[PDB]
Design a binder for this molecule. Structure first.
Ligand code: HEM
Ligand code: HEM
Lengths: 140, 143
C-alpha cells in the first residue's frame, strides 16, 4: 500500500534525523506476529543486498514484538535476548525501540552519532512518532 | 464523523505537546475548499462560544489551503494574506502550519501557534509536525 509506506518511511526518517541516530527502522506485523512491512534508513542498497533477507522478528526485535514496551539500551548486543546480527549486517550498539501502538509494530533507532545513549527526551519524541505511525496503520 | 475527529484531535494534541505550542488545530476540507472538520486544543468552550462561528478557511488559514506548503511565521498577523482574528479569538503570534496531505491531494492543515517559550517554531518543530500531519492524511484519506 503506497499510502502507508510513504508515511511510515517519512516517520522513520524524521525519527532518525531528530534524535541523530545513524540507523532507523520500523516493522509492522499482524496479530500472528508475522512481519508485514519493514522500512529502514541509513543502510545503502549494496549492504542490504549482502544481508540478503528481511528480519523475521527475532532476538531483541522479537522481544519488542512479544512484549511491546519501550526499551533503551547502551548495547543491544549485551541484552540477554540478543540473537546477534546476521552476516554483513552493520554492527549496532546504542538502541532505542518503541511500540507502534493505539500494538502493531516497532520503531527502532540505533547508534546515536555522538556515541552517547539515547536520552529520555529522545524516547519521548520517538514514542510520539510511533504513536503517529500507529494511527496511520490502524486507519490504513 | 466523530470517529475521524477523535483521531484528528489526538494528532493535534500530540503536535501541541511535542512542539510546546499554546494552541493547536487542524482543518479538513473538500475539493471546493469547504471546511468539513475543525478540531482544536488550548481554547476553552466558553471562549469558543463567544467566537461564535467556525473558521471558513480565510486569511492565513485559507493561504495554507490554497497553497499547501509548510509555513512558519514570527507574527501571523503581519503576513500579507492575514485577515485578522475574529472577536474573542485569542490573539496569536508565532505560527507553524503544515499541509495534511497524502499524494495527489491535500485535504487539510495542521497548525500550531504561540510556542510557550516565546520563541519562533524551529526547523525540528516543522519536521515533527510534518510527520504527524502525514499520519493524519492517512486517517483522512481512508475515512
Ligand atoms: C537500518 C536500520 C536497521 C536497524 C536499526 C536494525 C536493527 C537490528 C538489531 C538491533 C538487531 C539485533 C537483534 C538481536 O541481536 O537480538 C537486528 C537483527 C537482524 N536484522 Fe536489522 N536493522 C536494520 C536494518 C536491517 C536490514 C536492511 C535488514 C535486511 C535487509 C536487516 C536484517 C536483520 C536480520 C535478518 C536480523 C536477525 C534477527 C531477525 O531476523 O529478526 N536489518 N537488527
Ligand atoms: C486553538 C487553535 C486555533 C488556532 C491555532 C487558530 C489559528 C488561527 C489563525 C492563524 C487564523 C488566521 C488569522 C489571520 O488571517 O489574520 C485564524 C482565524 C480565524 N479563526 Fe482560529 N485558531 C484556533 C481556534 C479557533 C476556534 C476554536 C475557532 C471557532 C470555533 C476559530 C475561528 C476562526 C475564524 C472564524 C477565523 C477567520 C478566518 C476564517 O474564517 O477561516 N479559531 N485562526
Amino acid at each position: 500500500d503506497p499510502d502507508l509506506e510513504a508515511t511510515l518511511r517519512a516517520i522513520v526518517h524524521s525519527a532518525t534525523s531528530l534524535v541523530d541516530a545513524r540507523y532507523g527502522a520500523m516493522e509492522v506485523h499482524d496479530r500472528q506476529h508475522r512481519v508485514l512491512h519493514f522500512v529502514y534508513e541509513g543502510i545503502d542498497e549494496e549492504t542490504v543486498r549482502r544481508i540478503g533477507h528481511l528480519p523475521k522478528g527475532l532476538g531483541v526485535i522479537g522481544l519488542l514484538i512479544e512484549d511491546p514496551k519501550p526499551l533503551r539500551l547502551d548495547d543491544v548486543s549485551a541484552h540477554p535476548a540478543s540473537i546477534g546480527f546476521p552476516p554483513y549486517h552493520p554492527p549496532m550498539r546504542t538502541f532505542l525501540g518503541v511500540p507502534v501502538r493505539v500494538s502493531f509494530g516497532t520503531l527502532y533507532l540505533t547508534d546515536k552519532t555522538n556515541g552517547q545513549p539515547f536520552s529520555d527526551d529522545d524516547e519521548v519524541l520517538v514514542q510520539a512518532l510511533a504513536a503517529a505511525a500507529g494511527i496511520a496503520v490502524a486507519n490504513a
